[PDB]
Design a protein around this ligand. Structure first.
Ligand SMILES: CCOc1cc([C@@H](Nc2ccc3cnccc3c2)C(=O)NS(=O)(=O)c2cccc(S(N)(=O)=O)c2)ccc1OC(C)C
Ligand SMILES: [Ca+2]
Lengths: 55, 254
């Protein structure tokens, strides 16, 4: 790893027992099967600008 | 904001305008539907605690366009370590009386995790600072929300790159410097409490709070911001707690 380039995570990174790493997302987001990407699960997720996202 | 630009309407949707008796007091940041992060110093001279209003979806102070949502501030939470009239621990957590309704013009900014903020966000060079504060030192305040892109610097570098002034406050581990030393661009006294927002992989995060400086855009000086990463746990614990009677609450820190 989390120390190195955020463990490849788009949002949050947790280090585990060994060379194990779990990416996580802020509430209003879900982790994709790539285990790194965060996709919104709500209409207005935090830190996204609707008029820019809709353009 | 000195040397910035108008934030196009809806592009700073987490920006809060705090009012006391209808008068501009400070800025703030919406972090979810009922919580706002501002600066503790904003509340040093408040006696009329029931006249404290937070406005979301605000852009132009001369017109009502219908996207503005105002809420009574039910609680102001300040760390026990903050001393009124001083600079250290300059943070406040505000609980709105009713939630705001999220729309295209009202969206919260992400309060990041501590580790992510220290290990990744602290190294993003540039971040945005915003408010309806002074357009110049000894100037008029803005009618439209202003935004400025500022670079972050390490405290050793901030101290050595700054003009040595007498009785000047220390830059603690609860602060960071951001901005320009050439006297052209800075946040200002009326921007206090406002967001210092950092972009990382398509998402914006709260990393700082407009706190203090020596004048506005003063040669040899940078803006000083509350280092939000130091308060993540303190903020999270409070958001999970039940409201308490009384507007002002002092909460133990750490
Ligand atoms: C903790 C707050 O500390 C101070 C805050 C400000 C000012 N905010 C500013 C000022 C300049 C800035 C320049 N660049 C970026 C951001 C800026 C933000 C402000 O609040 N002025 S004010 O008059 O509304 C005010 C209210 C409560 C407390 C204080 S006080 N007692 O700390 O001076 C001042 C000025 C001096 C401060 O004091 C130190 C001892 C230099
Ligand atoms: Ca308006």
């Amino acid at each position: 790893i989390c120390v190195n380039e955020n463990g490849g995570c788009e949002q949050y990174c947790s280090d585990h027992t060994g060379t194990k790493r779990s990416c996580r997302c802020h509430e209003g987001y879900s982790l994709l099967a790539d285990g790194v990407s965060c996709t919104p699960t709500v209409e207005y997720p935090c830190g996204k600008i609707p008029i820019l996202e809709k353009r | 904001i000195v040397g910035g630009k108008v934030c196009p309407k809806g592009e700073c949707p987490w920006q809060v305008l705090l009012l006391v008796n209808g008068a501009q007091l400070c800025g703030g940041t919406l972090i979810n539907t009922i919580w706002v992060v501002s600066a503790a110093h904003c509340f040093d001279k408040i006696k009329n605690w029931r006249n404290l209003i937070a406005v979301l979806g605000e852009h132009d102070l001369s017109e009502h366009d219908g996207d503005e949502q105002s809420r009574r501030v039910a609680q102001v939470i300040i760390p026990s370590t903050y001393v009124p009239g001083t600079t250290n621990h300059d943070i406040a957590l505000l609980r709105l009386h009713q939630p705001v309704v999220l729309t295209d013009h009202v969206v919260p900014l992400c309060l990041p995790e501590r580790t992510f903020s220290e290990r990744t966000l602290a190294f993003v060079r540039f971040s945005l600072v915003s408010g309806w504060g002074q357009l110049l030192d000894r100037g008029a305040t803005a009618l439209e929300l202003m935004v400025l892109n500022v670079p972050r610097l390490m405290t050793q570098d901030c101290l050595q790159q700054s003009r040595k002034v007498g009785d000047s406050p220390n830059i603690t581990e609860y602060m960071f410097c951001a901005g320009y030393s050439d006297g052209s661009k800075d946040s200002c006294k009326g921007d206090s409490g406002g967001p210092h927002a950092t972009h990382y992989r398509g998402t914006w995060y709260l990393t700082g709070i407009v706190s203090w400086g020596q004048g506005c855009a003063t040669v040899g000086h940078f803006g000083v911001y509350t280092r939000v990463s130091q308060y993540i746990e303190w903020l999270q614990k409070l958001m999970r707690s039940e409201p308490r009677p009384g507007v002002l609450l002092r909460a133990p820190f750490p």
